[PDB]
Amino acid sequence: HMAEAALEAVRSELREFPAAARELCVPLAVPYLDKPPTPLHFYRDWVCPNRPCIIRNALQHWPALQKWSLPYFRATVGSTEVSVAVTPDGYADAVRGDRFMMPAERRLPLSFVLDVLEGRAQHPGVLYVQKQCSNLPSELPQLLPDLESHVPWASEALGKMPDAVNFWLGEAAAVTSLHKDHYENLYCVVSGEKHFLFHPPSDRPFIPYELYTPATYQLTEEGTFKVVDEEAMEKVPWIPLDPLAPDLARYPSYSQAQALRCTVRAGEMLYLPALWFHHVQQSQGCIAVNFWYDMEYDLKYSYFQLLDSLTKASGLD
Amino acid sequence: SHMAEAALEAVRSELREFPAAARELCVPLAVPYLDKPPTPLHFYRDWVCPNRPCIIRNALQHWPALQKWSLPYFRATVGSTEVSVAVTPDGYADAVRGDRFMMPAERRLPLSFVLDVLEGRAQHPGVLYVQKQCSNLPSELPQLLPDLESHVPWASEALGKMPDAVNFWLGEAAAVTSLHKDHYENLYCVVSGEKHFLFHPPSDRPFIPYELYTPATYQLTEEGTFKVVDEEAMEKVPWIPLDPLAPDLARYPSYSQAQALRCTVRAGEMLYLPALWFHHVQQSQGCIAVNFWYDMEYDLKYSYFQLLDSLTKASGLD
Numbered sequence: 001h002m003a004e005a006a007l008e009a010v011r012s013e014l015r016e017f018p019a020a021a022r023e024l025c026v027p028l029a030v031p032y033l034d035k036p037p038t039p040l041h042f043y044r045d046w047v048c049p050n051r052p053c054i055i056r057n058a059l060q061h062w063p064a065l066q067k068w069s070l071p072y073f074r075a076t077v078g079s080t081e082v083s084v085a086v087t088p089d090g091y092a093d094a095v096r097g098d099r100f101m102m103p104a105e106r107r108l109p110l111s112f113v114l115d116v117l118e119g120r121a122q123h124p125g126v127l128y129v130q131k132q133c134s135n136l137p138s139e140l141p142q143l144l145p146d147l148e149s150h151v152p153w154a155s156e157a158l159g160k161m162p163d164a165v166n167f168w169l170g171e172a173a174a175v176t177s178l179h180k181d182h183y184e185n186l187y188c189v190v191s192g193e194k195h196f197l198f199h200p201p202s203d204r205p206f207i208p209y210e211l212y213t214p215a216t217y218q219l220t221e222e223g224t225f226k227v228v229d230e231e232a233m234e235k236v237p238w239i240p241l242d243p244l245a246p247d248l249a250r251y252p253s254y255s256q257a258q259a260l261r262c263t264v265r266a267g268e269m270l271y272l273p274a275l276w277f278h279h280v281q282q283s284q285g286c287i288a289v290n291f292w293y294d295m296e297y298d299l300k301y302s303y304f305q306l307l308d309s310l311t312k313a314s315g316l317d
Numbered sequence: 318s319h320m321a322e323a324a325l326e327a328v329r330s331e332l333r334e335f336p337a338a339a340r341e342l343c344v345p346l347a348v349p350y351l352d353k354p355p356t357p358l359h360f361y362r363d364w365v366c367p368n369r370p371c372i373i374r375n376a377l378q379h380w381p382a383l384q385k386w387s388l389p390y391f392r393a394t395v396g397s398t399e400v401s402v403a404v405t406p407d408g409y410a411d412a413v414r415g416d417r418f419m420m421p422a423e424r425r426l427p428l429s430f431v432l433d434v435l436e437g438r439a440q441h442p443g444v445l446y447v448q449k450q451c452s453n454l455p456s457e458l459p460q461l462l463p464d465l466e467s468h469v470p471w472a473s474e475a476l477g478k479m480p481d482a483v484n485f486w487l488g489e490a491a492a493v494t495s496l497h498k499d500h501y502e503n504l505y506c507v508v509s510g511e512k513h514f515l516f517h518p519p520s521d522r523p524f525i526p527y528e529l530y531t532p533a534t535y536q537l538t539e540e541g542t543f544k545v546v547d548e549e550a551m552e553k554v555p556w557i558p559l560d561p562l563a564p565d566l567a568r569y570p571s572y573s574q575a576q577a578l579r580c581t582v583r584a585g586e587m588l589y590l591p592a593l594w595f596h597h598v599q600q601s602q603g604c605i606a607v608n609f610w611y612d613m614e615y616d617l618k619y620s621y622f623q624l625l626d627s628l629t630k631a632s633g634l635d
């Protein structure tokens with residue numbers, strides 16, 4: 001009886017938190033820094049308040065920035081075998097139909113990827129060097145001397161070294177579905193550009209989540225794609241909504257969230273804070289590197305956990 | 318419907334678990350000690366941003382006050398100075414008493430008389446405490462400013478701002494500061510004696526009770542008795558009725574699922590009391606203390622605490 005009234009009160013506060021939080025803590029545009037910050041300034045101004053920014057002139061020390069290019073990769077590591085994600089439509093690790101679709105895993109010489117990117121050669125579907133798991137040192141070690149194993153002022157600020165360094169090189173059709181990571185992320189564009197769409201963690205009440213049975217694409221011999229359910233896998237929660245084409249009929253509440261878009265260009269470094277929902281688009285053959293630092297699990301993390309569970313518990317998700 | 322009653326219980330269940338879940342990750346079992354002042358970066362990353370307390374030793378060695386300051390030294394130095402003194406019948410200024418938020422009687426007495434009371438050479442009705450705050454050290458006792466620093470340099474650099482106020486504290490052992498929290502980063506410097514702190518983290522809010530009280534002020538009558546005059550001009554004030562020293566578990570049973578964190582801060586030591594932390598304060602007789610208030614950043618942790626506070630009310634736990 002009366003409990004229903006208490007439930008709507010709780011729901012109203014959860015619905016009001018995302019607006020309150022952004023007016024106080026979320027920028028109106030992802031800000032630019034004229035130069036790398038000091039470790040103290042970085043932690044106080046961006047890391048602790050959990051706020052994104054793009055740092056200019058932070059890679060001028062990197063040999064890679066003057067050297068890296070599709071022709072340079074061909075000459076330098078063309079024969080190196082790399083892991084390449086293949087999908088029919090360019091959405092790896094994304095909800096397609098009623099399944100969480102995982103990429104097809106293929107080993108291919110880098111040279112081939114470069115030909116496909118340049119339109120020199122074809123392949124069914126969409127290619128993306130996107131292995132992660134610190135794929136830069138793991139698969140293209142010969143490129144390590146062309147960059148720093150870490151961002152010194154950022155590593156000093158956080159008091160720890162990165163847990164992984166990943167290399168990203170994909171087709172323009174290769175889109176990363178909206179998701180969040182429990183890492184502090186420094187995303188460095190060496191060539192081309194990346195188009196980032198953001199939601200802050202405090203938008204959680206309006207970001208829909210559902211459980212999907214996991215599946216993987218299997219690439220046939222006939223040049224088509226099959227779906228192989230991962231029968232021996234626990235189910236995985238994921239965000240079904242496309243921020244670029246949101247289904248406001250199924251999840252009207254996403255309109256009450258507010259996305260923050262931005263583009264990061266070659267030579268620029270983006271600080272993407274921990275737990276921020278992000279969706280990523282790239283230019284054809286974009287070359288990028290990102291540094292992952294495990295986040296600190298403190299009051300901000302415990303608070304988000306409460307927000308995430310209460311979003312579900314209150315029936316907003 | 319029947320689902321609504323079940324949904325509300327799932328919410329309340331998560332809220333009641335949050336304080337224990339949060340403290341396992343974020344709240345220490347005991348207040349840690351530091352052997353020397355930290356660097357600005359270390360101070361921000363280890364204590365401020367994670368929002369957790371510590372006591373810093375050997376941080377006041379540059380303060381002449383640490384060698385000079387004492388009850389006798391003050392008498393010679395500022396004994397004739399008139400200062401605002403809080404007076405209450407029982408030693409509890411800014412505390413819930415019955416159906417009113419009781420504010421102390423503020424009187425302007427020369428400091429020479431306060432020292433007499435503390436040393437037992439003289440007597441006064443009720444309990445004396447110099448706690449006016451509002452930066453009462455530069456405002457009322459400017460002669461003492463040379464004996465210390467106008468701010469804490471390594472802390473000011475870390476927080477990127479200057480202190481919003483510097484307060485002088487001196488009171489009887491019977492004068493207790495009720496449990497409350499501030500919207501400030503607080504650096505509490507004990508110059509002489511000792512202060513005993515009892516803490517609750519912000520995340521204990523689900524079980525920390527709050528009520529709205531009519532404000533009233535004590536009035537000392539010429540006969541040495543205390544009258545209660547209500548403050549009609551102020552709107553109702555929210556305050557914590559509960560006494561961590563004698564908890565009324567019959568009235569507020571839910572405090573038992575909270576967990577207090579106690580510690581003592583001695584002369585020469587500096588406590589970092591993080592913003593929004595609930596704290597309750599006792600002092601030895603004539604304890605001498607100074608504290609720096611830096612305004613907190615109103616960031617995501619503030620919004621999160623505001624949400625937790627609001628949810629505590631919407632859900633019926635408070």
Ligand SMILES: O=C(O)CCC(=O)C(=O)O
Pocket residue numbers: 168175176181185187280281290
């Ligand atoms: O670059 C991408 O496509 C994804 C990047 C990402 O997911 C991350 O850095 O956390």
Ligand SMILES: O=C(O)CCC(=O)C(=O)O
Pocket residue numbers: 486493494499503505598599608
């Ligand atoms: O010194 C006391 O008794 C209380 C001080 C206090 O409330 C504070 O430092 O914020």
Ligand SMILES: [Mn+2]
Pocket residue numbers: 179180181278
């Ligand atoms: Mn990511």
Ligand SMILES: [Mn+2]
Pocket residue numbers: 497498499596
């Ligand atoms: Mn206080």
